[PDB]
Design a protein around this ligand. Structure first.
Ligand SMILES: CCCCCCCCCCCC(=O)OC[C@H](COP(=O)(O)OCC[N+](C)(C)C)OC(=O)CCCCCCCCCCC
Ligand SMILES: CCCCCCCCCCCC(=O)OC[C@H](COP(=O)(O)OCC[N+](C)(C)C)OC(=O)CCCCCCCCCCC
Ligand SMILES: CCCCCCCCCCCC(=O)OC[C@H](COP(=O)(O)OCC[N+](C)(C)C)OC(=O)CCCCCCCCCCC
Ligand SMILES: CCCCCCCCCCCC(=O)OC[C@H](COP(=O)(O)OCC[N+](C)(C)C)OC(=O)CCCCCCCCCCC
Ligand SMILES: CCCCCCCCCCCC(=O)OC[C@H](COP(=O)(O)OCC[N+](C)(C)C)OC(=O)CCCCCCCCCCC
Ligand SMILES: CCCCCCCCCCCC(=O)OC[C@H](COP(=O)(O)OCC[N+](C)(C)C)OC(=O)CCCCCCCCCCC
Ligand SMILES: CCCCCCCCCCCC(=O)OC[C@H](COP(=O)(O)OCC[N+](C)(C)C)OC(=O)CCCCCCCCCCC
Ligand SMILES: CCCCCCCCCCCC(=O)OC[C@H](COP(=O)(O)OCC[N+](C)(C)C)OC(=O)CCCCCCCCCCC
Ligand SMILES: CCCCCCCCCCCC(=O)OC[C@H](COP(=O)(O)OCC[N+](C)(C)C)OC(=O)CCCCCCCCCCC
Ligand SMILES: CCCCCCCCCCCC(=O)OC[C@H](COP(=O)(O)OCC[N+](C)(C)C)OC(=O)CCCCCCCCCCC
Ligand SMILES: [Cl-]
Ligand SMILES: [Cl-]
Ligand SMILES: [Cl-]
Ligand SMILES: [Cl-]
Ligand SMILES: [Cl-]
Ligand SMILES: [Cl-]
Ligand SMILES: [Cl-]
Ligand code: NA
Ligand code: NA
Ligand code: NA
Ligand code: NA
Ligand code: NA
Ligand code: NA
Lengths: 311, 311, 311, 311, 311
């Protein structure tokens, strides 16, 4: 059990395929997902060639230990995949058809810039390391790349599962490495974010703006401070669902901007009271009346600017 | 150790059975459940046939390694099941009776639309992949399908555990696949949701409506804003128990609608105060008196409409 | 390696014993506990009988693989126990003395009705399945049933660890099954619940009742609404430490009833205000004075009724 | 592979040693800690005697399976330790020097009475069970007992790692058991508790006492009720870090006592208002002035009494 | 299979290399990180030397079991690494080139003093224990030390991955131990802390300072007490992300100091009210006007002092 020797000096081509059975546990904080799939491998081993007329069989079945099998690994995994060999079939010319079913936890970075209206390209990198005897190169058998219809990733829509057919061949620790990129294109189901986070957050913000139709400082203080505390609750809830990013997320920007609106509303409420106490409610009245238009208008404009920058 | 050869060209029938011992960890967020069960398998292998007279024994016991056993797998599992072979019995005609006890974590999607008054059909898909020598087809031995009396799934009532006797035979990667659907019908024990979430949520909403029997704006602001914060606490509690769905759930709809009622109550309280300050308490009084009837009436009607759409 | 043949048609008796070493992780929500114990097994195998005079030894030690050992399993486990064989001793008559040390996660339902003043009977079900050659029956060797003094289950008092000596013999999938019930009787250490949940919950309720010695509606609204929010915090804390039950628990009933007391106190506060505004403080005064006695009296009586129904 | 026979009737002495490499995950709630250490064992097996002149080697190296090794276990573990044999060296006289590196999760009860100014003695119990052929006794090789300088247990100071050299030899299930006690003495780093829990809790309590310099009932109600809610938040935070104890802890006692101070402050605020309303502010003034001294004095005295009882 | 004998009395040099493939799960509380890397080993075994002319091959491939391999371990790991041997190549002189891919959870203490503007040096300690036959010493092959470009540690910037080429050779349990230090230099991405924790915390503090432009005690009490509760929420959130340290962290110091600012603001608000009630609003006015400058000035100065001490 050693690699098949070359006829000339050509590398050994291992044709690959991944057929997704299950996709689950897409952890946004960890930037990981779990996969249960079929991994098909195919290569020619002339040492295994036979005459079907003399042997009586058109195909030969082998045990993994009985023959040479290329050491194929996943790059972006936590631990080595848990694999169970399904079948090893050898045709008369010595063409081997290997099939295994595996489970793995894949590390794939996510771009949260447009969260929760984001799309991701999850990667599964297949790799083989060349041996001293000969160089091993990877290929894609497009006929053996797919996913079943039942593949459901909770909170996501699956668009496509394709493979970049040209491998990335590079040298690592004085040996050739042949890498294939299997890309799973997904898009977030943003629906739930609207009644659970977005609209509740807007309702409390609009409730704080009723202080612009009130001269009662004590009630105005209760209105703006209480809704601010409710906004803090939603901010904390959102940041518990997401990892910490070295950039601003769309939701993060809106959440942050709303703090400025609460801050300016506290300033308005304070100014209005100060003037009323200073026996100038006429000045206070004009500021409060302006705020009634200014706050929703500036909020609508700032959100248009934010949506423009992010989308 | 190779599959039993056919007498004519007929496929090999592997009769199956699942007897549930334990059902636990039904995770709503993950849409998974854990199962501990017996898996029985039966097929004829004429190569194992014997005369019971000359052998002296009526039934022969074999070790898994000693004989050919079909590679049976579960489709909707996280990882391959943890199995322990209990018994392998062979009758004189060569009929094999295999029994194993296994544990597995099953992926089964849940429909939360009617939550917490929802019913679910959990699936366990048994599968076999055919070999080059012969095609393997699955069957259900109804006598070997069941569950013990002690099977308890916390927070759920188990209705039935049946099997769709006709297998789904299809081609996958140029080989026949034979799939069986084992269905576990369950209904959610909604009891606890009434004193823990539903009634507390209604009590705080009804407490906010006492503002319609008060002219004190500052007290009215405290009443409606405080109860709103308590409503947000319950909303967050509910959404931590459930996954994010691309549809509205029954509880989700009620929770969302109640925000509109708090919003309109803030509008009422603001309007009532504005008019009182504007020296028109007669206009304010008629709006407040109307609200006393309008708010409970509209709440009762909206809930009838919601219950109608969902059930 | 096959089961010992019968002398007459009698079943094979496997004497059992469980000696608890560690008891930990009693999860109320999951209704599971972890156990680390010794499992002793004893049965006669005449094929292993020897003359101690000819052999020179009065006991023979065997490796598990060298001899037939009954396939003993636990019924109510998540996964098969992790076992390490300690010793296998054979006496001249062929009596085998097997000892293993194991760890397992046991599924045992709990009755939360009297929580946190509840007692439980945890079960460990030992089982053996019969073979075609002969029927295997389980027995209890009371001398080999116990627990060490150091066995501590955090938040619980261990009363007894006994075994129901008569096995439950039944037919399952056309083979006899022999089941033994090992019962671990425990009682909850309710101490901590008094200073952590019960008294804090009563203090906030009594703080809300100070509104009956106040004519200040705005202060009364703050008192009752704030303490209600603190009561909601305790309700949520309690329901996070418990699973969802299709029945009321003692704590659950008290917690639920206290919502009614807060609701009626809001009604009182609203009524008192309304009258004091309709220029009838004399009517308001008599209602408030009555409430001072009515609220603690009805609370004390309702709690006596609740404690009576639950204990 | 059986135990070495005795020269006379003496028991077999297995010299032991534990050298700590890593100490981590001291879980207070679970009362467990994780350990990564070296376990050294030494015993004489005269059957392994060799002539170094004939063998050519002065010390023979063996594989665990090749020779008899005593079945040494830990008593207070969740599951059996994960061990990797480092070396097995045999000298000509048949003296075996065994070394393994292991990882285990140890169950060791903690005394929370003085929390967070508590010290603990973590135990690691080594045990061996005797065989029918001969009795096995444990011993401590003090030269092979220690810990590396890098051993850090987060939130704790490690004082000493010693062994009680005299084993506890007792009969269990009709065989001798030899137990050794390895004691890891640790003291909690209380530092963090002062700026994170203790001082924030005292600041909010002192903020509630500003109500004794205020005649404004509505403001006084806000002061005491709000700080009480903040106290409940800290109580919940503390009880999430600790297990439920059938005794009072130091922190638990202080936290509980502070509820009584908030309760009495609510009584004071209510009394002060009632008298002011009853046109007797002179009586109210003397009670409020007394409270200014009484509350801090009684708080300081009660804490001295508590610290005395606990330390 | 025993270690290669020395030519003279020199120790056996095992050249090492670590090439990082994945870096994930840097847990601040646990002070652990997960690593997936290549571990290369190289040493001379003259017993494996061959003539390439006679053998026909320039390199020989071996199975791990077929040859002697040094027992290399990681010091600061939870459990032994999960390793898969990739290749074992032997050159004519007997120079062995070993390569494995492993995954491990590394224990590496973190200095939180400057959090969240902190930098760390994560350590991976490689170790070998010497045998009776000969001493084994570790070395660094700098050509086989690195990391791939795709190596991403969420919330951190990776600066360098180097090795301290001189090993720490010391005696442990009467045998030589050879230790190598692989250092992974990382710096925290502080960006997210600014819009998520720092600015929200400053906004609420600045909102409390609006009480210095208000004579309304009841509104002032609401302002300062409400923002204090919001500050407590952020303190709790921060201490849930960090472990308990026996020193002050930068964030911990700022958070603690802000409590003093809220405390003094409550004192100011109380003093201002007391004087107004005592018919001296002129004294109150001068204190309030001074506070408007004093609070931001002292806050800015105290923060300059804190930043100076910490950086
Ligand atoms: C005319 C008043 C304008 C006020 C503008 C205040 C902007 C504060 C900028 C904060 C930057 C971060 C530090 C915040 C202190 C609160 C300011 C209260 C203002 C009260 C105004 C009284 C009416 C004369
Ligand atoms: C509070 C502020 C309101 C937030 C508004 C949603 C943001 C938005 O408009 O998001 C936009 C995204 C879609 O983005 P896309 O088409 O995939 O981007 C690709 C665009 N290119 C190719 C031009 C660069 O979602 C939607 O379909 C919006 C529906 C949700 C509305 C929720 C309203 C409440
Ligand atoms: C007659 C007044 C009707 C007010 C209707 C308010 C419609 C708000 C629609 C929001 C849609 C989302 C943005 C919400 C601002 C708060 C409005 C306060 C109203 C005060 C009325 C004063 C009495 C004249
Ligand atoms: C405010 C809203 C409160 C929620 C009211 C319950 C909704 C409901 O009426 O829920 C209904 C469900 C049962 O539904 P089903 O029989 O399984 O549906 C079958 C529908 N087909 C025929 C279309 C398939 O629960 C109950 O038995 C109601 C008892 C709970 C009362 C809670 C009182 C508070
Ligand atoms: C005489 C007054 C009796 C009030 C009884 C109220 C019963 C409420 C029943 C709720 C059933 C669940 C829905 C609750 C609305 C709040 C009621 C406010 C009452 C104000 C009284 C004003 C003084 C005349
Ligand atoms: C307000 C409600 C506070 C709850 C009161 C305790 C309920 C109870 O009465 O609990 C009672 C249980 C014991 O019950 P048992 O004897 O095992 O029941 C079996 C009885 N038979 C055989 C008659 C059916 O514990 C105690 O004595 C603890 C009392 C703690 C009181 C703490 C008060 C604060
Ligand atoms: C002179 C007033 C003394 C008050 C004593 C109150 C004892 C409460 C004991 C609780 C035991 C647990 C039950 C608590 C009700 C709140 C009491 C409010 C008191 C108002 C006093 C009014 C001024 C005359
Ligand atoms: C409000 C209550 C604040 C808590 C006060 C600390 C309790 C205490 O004084 O704790 C004492 C422990 C030390 O305990 P020990 O030396 O091991 O006891 C020995 C007992 N003998 C003599 C019986 C053997 O910590 C200290 O050094 C106190 C430093 C913390 C001060 C926190 C200030 C805020
Ligand atoms: C001139 C008033 C100075 C007040 C200084 C207060 C220092 C508190 C020190 C706490 C140390 C920790 C113990 C805190 C009690 C609250 C004090 C309320 C002060 C009210 C002043 C009334 C106006 C005359
Ligand atoms: C409220 C207080 C706000 C916190 C202020 C930041 C602390 C700081 O000034 O942090 C400083 C660190 C950089 O540290 P360094 O240069 O690598 O240290 C070298 C130390 N020597 C000279 C001793 C070797 O971050 C920054 O560049 C600050 C940018 C973030 C500003 C966020 C403000 C909002
Ligand atoms: Cl892999
Ligand atoms: Cl499976
Ligand atoms: Cl088991
Ligand atoms: Cl029966
Ligand atoms: Cl039977
Ligand atoms: Cl162990
Ligand atoms: Cl290791
Ligand atoms: Na191979
Ligand atoms: Na087989
Ligand atoms: Na056996
Ligand atoms: Na051995
Ligand atoms: Na208030
Ligand atoms: Na080896």
């Amino acid at each position: 059990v050693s690699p098949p020797p070359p006829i000339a000096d050509e590398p050994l081509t291992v044709n690959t395929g991944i057929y997704l059975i299950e996709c689950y546990s897409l952890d946004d904080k960890a930037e990981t997902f779990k996969v249960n799939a079929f991994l098909s491998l195919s290569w020619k081993d002339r040492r295994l060639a036979f005459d079907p007329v003399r042997s009586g069989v058109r195909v030969k079945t082998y045990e993994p230990e009985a023959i040479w099998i290329p050491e194929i690994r996943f790059v972006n995994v936590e631990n080595a995949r848990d694999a169970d060999v399904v079948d090893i079939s050898v045709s008369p010319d010595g063409t081997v058809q290997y099939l295994e079913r595996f489970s793995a936890r894949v590390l794939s970075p996510l771009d949260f810039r447009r969260y929760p209206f984001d799309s991701q390209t999850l990667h599964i990198y297949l790799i083989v390391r060349s041996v001293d005897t000969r160089n091993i190169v990877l290929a894609v058998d497009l006929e053996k790349v797919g996913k079943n219809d039942d593949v459901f990733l909770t909170g996501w829509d699956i668009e496509s599962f394709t493979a970049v057919v040209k491998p990335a061949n590079f040298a690592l620790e004085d040996r050739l490495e042949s890498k294939l990129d299997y890309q799973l294109r997904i898009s977030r189901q943003y629906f739930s974010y609207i009644p659970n986070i977005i609209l509740p957050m807007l309702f409390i913000l609009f409730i704080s703006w009723t202080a612009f139709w009130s001269t009662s400082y004590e009630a105005n203080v209760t209105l703006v401070v209480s809704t601010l505390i409710a906004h803090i609750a939603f901010n904390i809830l959102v940041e518990t669902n997401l990892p910490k990013t070295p950039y601003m997320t769309y939701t993060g920007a809106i959440i942050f901007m709303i703090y400025l609106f609460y801050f300016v509303a506290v300033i308005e409420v304070t100014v209005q009271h100060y003037l009323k106490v200073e026996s100038q409610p006429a000045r206070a009245a004009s500021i409060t009346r302006a705020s009634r238009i200014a706050f929703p208008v500036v909020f609508l404009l700032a959100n248009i600017i934010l949506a423009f920058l992010f989308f």
